[PDB]
PDB file of C-alpha atoms in Angstrom:
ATOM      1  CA  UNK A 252       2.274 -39.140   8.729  1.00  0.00           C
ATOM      2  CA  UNK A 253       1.492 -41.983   6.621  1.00  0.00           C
ATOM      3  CA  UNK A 254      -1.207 -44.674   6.135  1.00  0.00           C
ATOM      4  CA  UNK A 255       0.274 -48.387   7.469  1.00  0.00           C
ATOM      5  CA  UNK A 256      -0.534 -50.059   4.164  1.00  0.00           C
ATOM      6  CA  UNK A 257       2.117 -48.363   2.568  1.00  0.00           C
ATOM      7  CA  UNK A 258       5.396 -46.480   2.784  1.00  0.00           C
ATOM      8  CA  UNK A 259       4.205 -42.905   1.220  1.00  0.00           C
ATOM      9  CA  UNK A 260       3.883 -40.093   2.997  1.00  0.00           C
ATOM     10  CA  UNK A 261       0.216 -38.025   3.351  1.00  0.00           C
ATOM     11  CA  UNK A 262       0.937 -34.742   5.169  1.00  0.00           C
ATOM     12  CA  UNK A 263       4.754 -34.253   5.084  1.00  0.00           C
ATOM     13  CA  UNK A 264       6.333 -32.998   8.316  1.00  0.00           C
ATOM     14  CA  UNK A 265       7.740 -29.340   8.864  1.00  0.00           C
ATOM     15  CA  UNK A 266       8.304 -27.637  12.200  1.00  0.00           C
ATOM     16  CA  UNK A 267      10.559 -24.337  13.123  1.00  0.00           C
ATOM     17  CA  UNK A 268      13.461 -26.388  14.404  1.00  0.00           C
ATOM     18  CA  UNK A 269      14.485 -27.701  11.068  1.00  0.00           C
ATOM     19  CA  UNK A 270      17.298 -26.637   9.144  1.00  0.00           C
ATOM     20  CA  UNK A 271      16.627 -24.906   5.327  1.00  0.00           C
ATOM     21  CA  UNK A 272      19.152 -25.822   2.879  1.00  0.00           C
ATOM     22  CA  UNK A 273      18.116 -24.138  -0.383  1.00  0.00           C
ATOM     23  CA  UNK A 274      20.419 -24.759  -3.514  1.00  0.00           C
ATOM     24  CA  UNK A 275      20.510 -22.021  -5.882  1.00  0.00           C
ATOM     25  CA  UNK A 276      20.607 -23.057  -9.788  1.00  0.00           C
ATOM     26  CA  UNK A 277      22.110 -20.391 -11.858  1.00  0.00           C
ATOM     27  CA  UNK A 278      22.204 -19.663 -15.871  1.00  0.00           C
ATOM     28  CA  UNK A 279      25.225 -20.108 -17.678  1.00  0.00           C
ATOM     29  CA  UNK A 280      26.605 -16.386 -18.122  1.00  0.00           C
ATOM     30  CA  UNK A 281      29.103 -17.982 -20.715  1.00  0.00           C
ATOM     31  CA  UNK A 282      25.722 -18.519 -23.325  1.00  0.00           C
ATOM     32  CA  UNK A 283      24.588 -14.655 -23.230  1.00  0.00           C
ATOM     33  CA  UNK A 284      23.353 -12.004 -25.729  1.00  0.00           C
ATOM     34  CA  UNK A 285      25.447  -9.096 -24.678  1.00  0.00           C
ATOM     35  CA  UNK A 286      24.670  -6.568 -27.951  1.00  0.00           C
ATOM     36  CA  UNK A 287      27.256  -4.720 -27.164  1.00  0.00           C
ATOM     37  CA  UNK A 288      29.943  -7.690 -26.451  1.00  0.00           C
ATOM     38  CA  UNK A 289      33.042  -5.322 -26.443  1.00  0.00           C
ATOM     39  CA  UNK A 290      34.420  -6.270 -23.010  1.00  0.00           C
ATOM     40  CA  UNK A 291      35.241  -9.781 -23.525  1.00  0.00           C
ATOM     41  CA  UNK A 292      36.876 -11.936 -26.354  1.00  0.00           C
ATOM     42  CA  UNK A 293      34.950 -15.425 -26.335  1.00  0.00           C
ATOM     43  CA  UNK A 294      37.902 -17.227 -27.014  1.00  0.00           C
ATOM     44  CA  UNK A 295      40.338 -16.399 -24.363  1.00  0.00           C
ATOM     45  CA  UNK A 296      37.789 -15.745 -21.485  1.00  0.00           C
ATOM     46  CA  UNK A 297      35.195 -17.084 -19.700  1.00  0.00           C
ATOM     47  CA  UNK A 298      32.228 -15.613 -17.101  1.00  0.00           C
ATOM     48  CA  UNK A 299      31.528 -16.422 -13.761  1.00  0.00           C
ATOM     49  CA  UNK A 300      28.378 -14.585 -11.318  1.00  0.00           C
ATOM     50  CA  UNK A 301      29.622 -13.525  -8.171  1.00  0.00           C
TER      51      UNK A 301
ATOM     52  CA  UNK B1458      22.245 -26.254 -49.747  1.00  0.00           C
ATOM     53  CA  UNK B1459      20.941 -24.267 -46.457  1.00  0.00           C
ATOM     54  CA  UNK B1460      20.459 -25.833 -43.390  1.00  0.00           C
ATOM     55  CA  UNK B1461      18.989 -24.990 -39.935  1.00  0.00           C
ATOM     56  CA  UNK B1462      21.843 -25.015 -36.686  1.00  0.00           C
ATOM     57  CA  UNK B1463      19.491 -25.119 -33.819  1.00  0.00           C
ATOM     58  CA  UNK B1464      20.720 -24.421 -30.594  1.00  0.00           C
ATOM     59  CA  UNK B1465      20.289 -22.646 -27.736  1.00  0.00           C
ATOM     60  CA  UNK B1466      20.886 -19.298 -26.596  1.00  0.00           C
ATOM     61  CA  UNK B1467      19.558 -16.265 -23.753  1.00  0.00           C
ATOM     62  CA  UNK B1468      18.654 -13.387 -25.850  1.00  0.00           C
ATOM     63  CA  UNK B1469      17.055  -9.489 -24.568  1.00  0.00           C
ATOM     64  CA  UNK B1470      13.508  -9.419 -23.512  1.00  0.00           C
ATOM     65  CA  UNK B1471      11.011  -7.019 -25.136  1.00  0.00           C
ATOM     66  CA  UNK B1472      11.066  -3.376 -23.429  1.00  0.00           C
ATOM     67  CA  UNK B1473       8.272  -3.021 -20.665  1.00  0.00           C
ATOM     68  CA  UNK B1474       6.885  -0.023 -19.433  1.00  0.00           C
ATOM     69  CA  UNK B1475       8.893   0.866 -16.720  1.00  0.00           C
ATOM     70  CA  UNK B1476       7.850   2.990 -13.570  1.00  0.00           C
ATOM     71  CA  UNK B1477       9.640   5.989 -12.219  1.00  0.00           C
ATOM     72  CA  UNK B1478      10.245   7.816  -9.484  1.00  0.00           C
ATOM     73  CA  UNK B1479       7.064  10.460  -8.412  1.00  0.00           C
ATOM     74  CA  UNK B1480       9.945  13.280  -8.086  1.00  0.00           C
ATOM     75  CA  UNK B1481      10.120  13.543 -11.832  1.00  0.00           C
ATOM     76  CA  UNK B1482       7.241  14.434 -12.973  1.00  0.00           C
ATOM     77  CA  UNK B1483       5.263  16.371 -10.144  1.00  0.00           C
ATOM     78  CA  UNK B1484       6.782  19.724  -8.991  1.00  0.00           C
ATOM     79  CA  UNK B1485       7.394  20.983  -5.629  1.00  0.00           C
ATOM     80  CA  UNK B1486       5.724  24.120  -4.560  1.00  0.00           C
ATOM     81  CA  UNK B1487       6.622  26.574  -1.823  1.00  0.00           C
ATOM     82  CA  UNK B1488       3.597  26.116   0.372  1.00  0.00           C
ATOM     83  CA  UNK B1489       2.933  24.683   3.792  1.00  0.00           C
ATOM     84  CA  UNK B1490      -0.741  24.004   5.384  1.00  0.00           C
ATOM     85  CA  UNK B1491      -1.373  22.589   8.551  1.00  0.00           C
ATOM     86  CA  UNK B1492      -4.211  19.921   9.780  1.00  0.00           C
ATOM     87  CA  UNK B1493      -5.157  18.327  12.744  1.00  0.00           C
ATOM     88  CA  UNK B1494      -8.685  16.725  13.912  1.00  0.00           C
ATOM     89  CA  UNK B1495      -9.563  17.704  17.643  1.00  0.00           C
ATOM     90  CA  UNK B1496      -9.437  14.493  19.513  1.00  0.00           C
ATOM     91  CA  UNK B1497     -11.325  10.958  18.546  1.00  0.00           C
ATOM     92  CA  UNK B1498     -13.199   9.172  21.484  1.00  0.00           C
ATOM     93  CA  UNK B1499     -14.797   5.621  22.199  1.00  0.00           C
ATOM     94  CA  UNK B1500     -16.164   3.985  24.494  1.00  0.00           C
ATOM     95  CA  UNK B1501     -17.396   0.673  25.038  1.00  0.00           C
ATOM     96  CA  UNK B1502     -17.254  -3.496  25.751  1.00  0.00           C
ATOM     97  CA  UNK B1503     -14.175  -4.889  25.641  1.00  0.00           C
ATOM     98  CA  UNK B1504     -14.916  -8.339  24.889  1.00  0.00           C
ATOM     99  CA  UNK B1505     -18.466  -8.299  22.857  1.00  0.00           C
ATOM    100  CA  UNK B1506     -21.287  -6.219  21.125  1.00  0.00           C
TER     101      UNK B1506
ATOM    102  CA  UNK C1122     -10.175  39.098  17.745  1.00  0.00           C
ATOM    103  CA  UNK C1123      -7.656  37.185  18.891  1.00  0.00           C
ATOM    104  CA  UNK C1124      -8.145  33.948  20.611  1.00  0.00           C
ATOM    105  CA  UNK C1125      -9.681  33.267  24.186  1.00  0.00           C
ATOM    106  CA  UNK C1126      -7.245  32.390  27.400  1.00  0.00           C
ATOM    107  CA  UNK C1127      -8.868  28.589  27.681  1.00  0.00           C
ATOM    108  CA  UNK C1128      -8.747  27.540  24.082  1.00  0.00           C
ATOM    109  CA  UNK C1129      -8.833  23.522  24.126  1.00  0.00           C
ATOM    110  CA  UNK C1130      -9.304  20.767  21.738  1.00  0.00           C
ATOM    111  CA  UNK C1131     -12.747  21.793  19.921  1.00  0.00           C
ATOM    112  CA  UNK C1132     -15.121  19.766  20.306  1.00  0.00           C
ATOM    113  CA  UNK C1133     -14.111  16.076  21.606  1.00  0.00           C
ATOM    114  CA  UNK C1134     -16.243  14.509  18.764  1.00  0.00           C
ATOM    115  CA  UNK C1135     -18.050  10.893  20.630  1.00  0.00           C
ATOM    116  CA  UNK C1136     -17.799   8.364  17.463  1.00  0.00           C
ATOM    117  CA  UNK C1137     -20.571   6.016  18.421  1.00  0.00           C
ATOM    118  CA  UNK C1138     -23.154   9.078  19.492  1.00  0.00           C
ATOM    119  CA  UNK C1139     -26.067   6.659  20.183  1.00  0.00           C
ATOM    120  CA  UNK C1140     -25.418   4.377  23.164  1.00  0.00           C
ATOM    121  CA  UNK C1141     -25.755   3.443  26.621  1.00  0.00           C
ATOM    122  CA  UNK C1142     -22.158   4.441  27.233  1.00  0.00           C
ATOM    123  CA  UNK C1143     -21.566   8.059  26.682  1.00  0.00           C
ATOM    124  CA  UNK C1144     -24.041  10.231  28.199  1.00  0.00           C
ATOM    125  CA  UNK C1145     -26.575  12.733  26.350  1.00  0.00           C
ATOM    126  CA  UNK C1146     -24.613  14.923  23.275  1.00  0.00           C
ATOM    127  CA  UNK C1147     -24.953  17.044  20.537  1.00  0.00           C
ATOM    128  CA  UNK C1148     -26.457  20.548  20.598  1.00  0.00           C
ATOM    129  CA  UNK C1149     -28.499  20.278  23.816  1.00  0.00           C
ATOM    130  CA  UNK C1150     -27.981  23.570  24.902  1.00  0.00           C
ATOM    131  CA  UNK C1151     -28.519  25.580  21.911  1.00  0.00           C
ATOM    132  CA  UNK C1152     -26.553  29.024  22.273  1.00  0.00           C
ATOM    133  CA  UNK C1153     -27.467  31.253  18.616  1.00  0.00           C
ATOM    134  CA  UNK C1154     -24.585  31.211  16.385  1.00  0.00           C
ATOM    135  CA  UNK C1155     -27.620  30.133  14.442  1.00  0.00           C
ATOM    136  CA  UNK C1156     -29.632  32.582  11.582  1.00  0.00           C
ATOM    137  CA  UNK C1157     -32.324  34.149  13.962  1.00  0.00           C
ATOM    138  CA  UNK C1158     -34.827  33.625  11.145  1.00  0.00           C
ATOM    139  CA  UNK C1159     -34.796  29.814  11.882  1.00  0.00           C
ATOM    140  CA  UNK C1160     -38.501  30.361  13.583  1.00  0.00           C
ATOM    141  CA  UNK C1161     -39.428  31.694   9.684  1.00  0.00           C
ATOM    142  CA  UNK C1162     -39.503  29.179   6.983  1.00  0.00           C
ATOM    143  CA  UNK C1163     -38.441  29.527   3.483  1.00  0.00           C
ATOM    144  CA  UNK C1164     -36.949  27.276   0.886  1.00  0.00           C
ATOM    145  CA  UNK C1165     -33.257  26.483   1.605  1.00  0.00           C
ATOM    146  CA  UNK C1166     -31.408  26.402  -2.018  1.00  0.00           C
ATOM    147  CA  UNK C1167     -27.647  25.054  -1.042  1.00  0.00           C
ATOM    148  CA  UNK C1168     -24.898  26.543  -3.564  1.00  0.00           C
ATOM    149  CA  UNK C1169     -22.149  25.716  -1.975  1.00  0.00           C
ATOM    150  CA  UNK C1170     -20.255  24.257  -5.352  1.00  0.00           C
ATOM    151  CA  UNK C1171     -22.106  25.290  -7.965  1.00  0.00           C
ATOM    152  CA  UNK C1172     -20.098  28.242  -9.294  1.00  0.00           C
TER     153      UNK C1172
END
């Protein structure tokens, strides 16, 4: 819906038949803490999440 | 001759509280008891008071 | 003793007792069970859980 002297919209529209694309942001795991940070050398590795 | 670096960094939270599991710190006993109510009954309008 | 042949559910327990819907309940015939001394007054002092 919108009001015909402009272009912006009042009440958006949603229904069931629509499609949800949600994009997931992630932190960096490469930029961590880790106290213990015995398992990798920072040099010749990198992180990844799976 | 000292100089701040400045960046940016995720670091480990402060400790909270956490909650466990009921099983550790309430025993089991060996006991059984049984209890049942007779029967519960109602009647009346279906569509108003 | 042990139990009677017709046991049943004790007691089917009407929630709403006053109504138009269920007929006339609770203690109408009065069969003893009772202290016989209910026809002699005195004053009632409940200890149930007070030890």
């Amino acid at each position: 819906i919108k009001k015909p002297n402009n272009n912006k919209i009042l009440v958006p529209k949603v229904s069931g038949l629509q499609y949800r694309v949600f994009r997931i942001h992630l932190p960096d795991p490469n930029k961590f803490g880790f106290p213990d940070t015995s398992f990798y050398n920072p040099d010749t590795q990198r992180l990844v999440w799976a | 001759l000292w100089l701040p670096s400045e960046a940016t960094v995720y670091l480990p939270p402060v400790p909270v509280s956490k909650v466990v599991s009921t099983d550790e710190y309430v025993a089991r006993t060996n006991i059984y008891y049984h209890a049942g109510t007779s029967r519960l009954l109602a009647v009346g309008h279906p569509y108003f008071p | 003793g042990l139990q009677p042949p017709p046991g049943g559910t004790l007691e089917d327990t009407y929630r709403f007792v006053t109504s138009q819907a269920i007929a006339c309940q609770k203690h109408t015939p009065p069969a003893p069970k009772e202290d016989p001394l209910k026809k002699y007054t005195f004053w009632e002092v409940n200890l149930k859980e007070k030890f």
